């Protein structure tokens, strides 16, 4: 009855095409984010999904009114008629604005004229990664959003609260299969492109990889098969065919294990930190095989040098193996 008049009077003589204060002062839009659940990061495409609530508030002078409510909660339908700032994500591959049963957009109008506008979004952002430290890598994925078709003179973004407390992540919702969320960081900047100077809000989410899987996945079979190649030295030199089979088995197991490890490793031009350990673990077996071959060669002419080579190999191999393991595990962590 009364509200219909109050509502029609506002939209009367209102043109959505013009943002508030076209010739007047610049418009200042405040922004806040609520990350409901942090989607599963991917390594093959270097993209991460995220589910967010996105809140914006600007002061629009024309929509001020006087009534008994002092706060109007309107349907989503009226969101299209008033002006609405266009805020796009600078590095979003393909987002989707959910409209489950009605468009998930909440609009609130205060009596002074301070609009509030919140949406629900799912954004698949892209972050370049560096895997030289894989699997010990720790990297940060950014999410940058800014205005479109508005220079710095026209629209300025700010954080609604203290920047450290703006981007809030729900504790239960954050689910990561492999990584582990660590912290959030915010920043404001100015990016210059062909059309002009745009203001850009940046939010880095820090990520650190879980390692408990790759220990029993690849490293332990490699170490066990290397220790088996070491035990190969203890075998009696007389059982030559048995020793040959013992040497060939380690190589076959290394081949199978290496193929299985390559199947999961992400394809990159860089040499990953795991591949060096794999190369060493794969080279020690060939070194033991070469030693056994040289023993089988020397045994006919002289038994003394054969026994000496056996003894020296036994006392020499595990020492260097352990030294290398210490160096490798000390360098990265």
């Amino acid at each position: 009855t009364v509200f219909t008049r109050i509502l029609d009077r506002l939209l009367d003589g209102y043109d959505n095409r013009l943002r508030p204060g076209l010739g007047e002062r610049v418009t200042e839009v405040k922004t806040d984010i609520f990350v409901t659940s942090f989607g599963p990061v991917s390594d093959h495409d270097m993209e991460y999904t995220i589910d967010v609530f996105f809140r914006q508030s600007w002061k629009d002078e024309r929509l001020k009114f006087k009534g008994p409510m002092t706060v109007l909660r309107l349907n989503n339908l009226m969101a299209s008629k008033i002006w609405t700032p266009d805020t796009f994500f600078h590095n979003g591959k393909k987002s989707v604005a959910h409209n489950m049963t009605m468009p998930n957009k909440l609009l609130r109008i205060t009596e002074d004229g301070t609009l509030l506008y919140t949406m629900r979004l799912t954004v698949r952002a892209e972050c370049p990664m560096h895997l030289e430290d894989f699997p010990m890598d720790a990297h940060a994925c950014p999410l940058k959003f800014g205005s479109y078709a508005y220079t710095r003179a026209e629209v300025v973004y700010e954080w609604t609260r203290e920047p450290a407390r703006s981007v809030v992540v729900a504790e239960d919702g954050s689910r990561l299969n492999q990584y582990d969320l660590l912290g959030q960081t915010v920043d404001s900047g100015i990016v210059q492109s062909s059309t002009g100077e745009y203001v850009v809000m940046t939010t880095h989410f820090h990520l650190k990889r879980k390692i408990g899987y790759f220990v029993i996945q690849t490293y332990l079979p490699c170490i066990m098969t290397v220790i088996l190649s070491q035990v190969s030295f203890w075998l009696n030199r007389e059982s030559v065919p048995a020793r040959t089979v013992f040497g060939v088995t380690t190589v076959l197991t290394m081949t199978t294990l290496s193929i299985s490890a390559r199947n999961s490793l992400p394809k990159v031009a860089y040499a990953t930190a795991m591949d060096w350990f794999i190369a060493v673990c794969y080279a020690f077996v060939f070194s033991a095989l070469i030693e056994f071959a040289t023993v089988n060669y020397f045994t006919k002419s002289q038994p003394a040098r054969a026994a000496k080579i056996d003894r020296l190999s036994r006392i020499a191999f595990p020492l260097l193996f352990g030294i290398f393991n210490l160096v490798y595990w000390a360098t990265y962590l």
Partner: antibody
Framework: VQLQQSGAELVKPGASVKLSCTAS????????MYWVKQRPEQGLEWIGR????????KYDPKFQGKATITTDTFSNTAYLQLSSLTSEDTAVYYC???????????WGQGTSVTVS | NIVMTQSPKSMSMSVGERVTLSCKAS??????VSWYQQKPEQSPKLLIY???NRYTGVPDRFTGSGSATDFTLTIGSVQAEDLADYHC????????FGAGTKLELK
């Protein structure tokens, strides 16, 4: 654009003093209000922050429970209230407004509170 | 809580000399620092907000440089009136201010 504060105050220990800053040229409901005390010949120190929209107030943990900030939007004024004063509490008080990436650009002339 | 450190404590420079003031932050602050100039017995004014942005009505000789945890205010041509206290205060979290630098002509 302009901020006005009350005159200098003299108070004996064990009493409460109230300081108020008035803003002209803008509604307080838009931006926050900051109160910052400064001792003679020492660095600035923050006291508290108030928001007129929800009335939420945050305090420096060392001053929590020792100062109270209130806003009156009708008279467009801010009010700071102190309690349990000591001789060490004597300092100058500044009321400010945030803007343009939280710069705290406009400060009041400054009020002086002496305990004796 | 985030704490600022300002260097040098007190420095004296002559007219026409380049001056540098450094501000180090313990935690991370993403280019939200601000520099305040306080004359004797007056109300602190604003010189630089954010990183390398000059407030309106401020001479061009003042320059700012920012990073993750290192910030620097640089003055080129210096005059008689330019001598005053300077504070670097951060607003990334609940705001706090550095110790302050006293600058006197020699």
């Amino acid at each position: 654009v302009q901020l006005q504060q009350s005159g200098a105050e003299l108070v004996k220990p064990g009493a409460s003093v109230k300081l108020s800053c008035t803003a002209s040229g803008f509604n307080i409901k838009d931006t926050y209000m900051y109160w910052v005390k400064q001792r003679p010949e020492q660095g600035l120190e923050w006291i508290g922050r108030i928001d007129p929209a929800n009335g939420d107030t945050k305090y420096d943990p060392k001053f929590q429970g020792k100062a109270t900030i209130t806003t009156d939007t009708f008279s467009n004024t801010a009010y700071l209230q102190l309690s349990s004063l000591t001789s060490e509490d004597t300092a100058v008080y500044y009321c400010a407004r945030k803007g343009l990436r939280w710069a705290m650009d406009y400060w009041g002339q400054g009020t002086s509170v002496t305990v004796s | 809580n985030i704490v600022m450190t300002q260097s040098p404590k007190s420095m004296s420079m002559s007219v026409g000399e380049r001056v540098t003031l450094s501000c180090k932050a313990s935690e991370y602050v993403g280019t939200y620092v601000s520099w305040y100039q306080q004359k004797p017995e007056q109300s602190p004014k604003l010189l630089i907000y954010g990183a390398s942005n000059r407030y309106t009505g401020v001479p061009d000789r003042f320059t700012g440089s920012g990073s993750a945890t290192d910030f620097t205010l640089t003055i080129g041509s210096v005059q008689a009136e330019d001598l005053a206290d300077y504070h670097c205060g951060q607003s990334y979290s609940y705001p706090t201010f550095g110790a302050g630098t006293k600058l006197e002509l020699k």
